[PDB]
From a paper:
Evidence indicates that variable lymphocyte receptors (VLRs) play roles equivalent to those of Igs and TCRs in the adaptive immune system of cyclostomes. VLRs consist of an N-terminal cap (LRRNT), the first LRR (LRR1), multiple (usually up to seven) 24-residue variable LRRs (LRRVs), a terminal or end LRRV (LRRVe), a connecting peptide (CP) and a C-terminal cap (LRRCT), followed by an invariant 3′-terminal region. Recently, a third VLR, designated VLRC, was identified in lampreys. VLRC sequences are more closely related to VLRA than to VLRB sequences, leading to the speculation that VLRC+ cells are T-lineage cells and that, like jawed vertebrates equipped with two lineages of T-cells (αβ and γδ T-cells) and one lineage of B-cells, lampreys may have two lineages of T-like cells (analogous to αβ and γδ T-cells) and one lineage of B-like cells.
The crystal structure of the lamprey VLRC ectodomain (residues from His25 to Cys247) was determined by molecular replacement at a resolution of 2.3 Å. The concave surface of lamprey VLRC is formed by the β-sheet made up of eight β-strands (two from LRRNT, five from LRRs and one from CP); the β1-strand is anti-parallel whereas the remaining β-strands are arranged in a parallel fashion. This revealed that variable residues are located predominantly on the concave surface, in particular in the region around the core β-sheet, suggesting that, similar to VLRA and VLRB, VLRC recognizes its ligands through the concave surface. A striking feature of lamprey VLRC is that its N-terminal cap has a long loop protruding toward the concave surface. This protrusion is formed by amino acid residues 41–48 located in the region connecting two β-strands β1 and β2. Indeed, ∼80% of known VLRC sequences from Lethenteron japonicum have the same sequence, NKTDSSPE, and the remaining ∼20% have closely related sequences. Crystallographic analysis of VLRC confirmed this prediction.
Author numbering: 25 to 247
The structure:
Amino acid sequence: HMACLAVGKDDICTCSNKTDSSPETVDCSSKKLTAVPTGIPANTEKLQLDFNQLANIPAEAFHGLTRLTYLALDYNQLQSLPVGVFDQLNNLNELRLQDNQLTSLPPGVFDSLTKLTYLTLSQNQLQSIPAGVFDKLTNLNRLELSTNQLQSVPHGAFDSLVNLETLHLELNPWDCACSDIIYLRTFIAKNTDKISGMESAQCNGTSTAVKDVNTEKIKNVTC
């Protein structure tokens, strides 16, 4: 068995042609899948692999899905993402990766996604974020990093996000005892007026708000 028998014919997943209320959809959600099925039609616009039991994504799983605008991989058991897994996905608008077990991301993993508007990485266990990982996402409106293991963010990580409207940073063990936090502290203070949801970023996860931190003491303490 595969994902679809045709564009509008189900197999494992529910497969719909594009309609006036929905894009061309392959719905594999809630199927307890342990593997990404083959047979995902080339013109698929919306791929829902959320709420399954995927532990690995094949590196070439999404190659050729040029029309993909929506990709849901949230609520699985992903420990990592393959290098280049989202390359070629030029038309992607939404990428849902929340509620996995991601500890890290490959550099340049989002680079092809120049039309991405919504990115969720919340409820994982990201220990760090690679430098420049968001630099290509100039059309991003909403980014969710809440509930992870981030102690800091690389200098200038959000600077290319000129169209950002919403950024969630809460429930992260932010390290406000060293100089690396100053960039984050500064970004929140400067952009709380144009980007929402940032003020919940707290030192050590649940302590003093990063935004209100006294930086004079730690400005010279190297992390």
